[PDB]
Structures are given as C-alpha cells and as structure tokens.
C-alpha cells in the first residue's frame, strides 16, 4: 500500500524555520509527481508546492513563494518542505501527498507563535 510518514514540525517564532520531511513507500516514488498540502483550524485544505519526479522544477501556492522550498531525494525515496521566515498564518498541519492517487499521510503540525 501506498504510505507517507511526514515528521519535521513544531512551534517556532515569527521568521523562524522548519524543514518538513515526507518518508515515502509501497509505490515507485521516482516517477511520481509529489505535493504538500496544508489544513489550518476552520479552513480548507490547501495546496502549497508541487514537484516533477525528477525534482528540477517546483510550483507554489502564492502565498508561500519565495519561503519554502519543495525538494526531493530520489535515493532515499523522501520529500522536503523547507519552510523558512515563517509566518502565524503559516500554523496549519501539514501534509505530504500522491497526487497520482490522492494519497495523503497523518500529517505533521507547525505552529507559529511568539
């Protein structure tokens, strides 16, 4: 079966950073397209970032661009999410993604707070 394990998050101050990893198995990860999501309290689940397979090329939701930073390692079958001068509005759980299949993980939290 398809399974994503997403760890990485925690509660940082406003400009602060976290790098999310997506652990990845049960599919032939190197030839799949992969995103992250995120779902804040009250608020639909959105789309963040998405990668090529290959991970040369990535496109962002609007109002992360230039923050995070979606990367893959193809050897190690994982995804990343560096986020960086994070933002309160940034706290959501984030979650790692197949698009493929519309598969999801648990998720992982981050929190941004003073």
């Known amino acids: 079966q398809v399974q994503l394990v997403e760890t990485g998050g925690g509660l940082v101050q406003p400009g602060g950073s976290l790098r999310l990893s997506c652990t990845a198995s049960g599919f032939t990860f190197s030839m799949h397209a992969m995103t992250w999501y995120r779902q804040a309290p009250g608020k639909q689940r959105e789309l963040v970032a998405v990668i090529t397979s290959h991970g040369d090329r990535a496109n962002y939701t609007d109002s992360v661009r230039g923050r995070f930073t979606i990367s893959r390692d193809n050897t190690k079958n994982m995804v990343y999410l560096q986020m960086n001068s994070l933002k309160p509005e940034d706290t959501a759980v984030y979650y790692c993604?197949?698009?493929?299949?519309?598969?999801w993980g648990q998720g992982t939290q981050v929190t941004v707070s003073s």
């Open positions: 993604n197949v698009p493929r299949y519309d598969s």
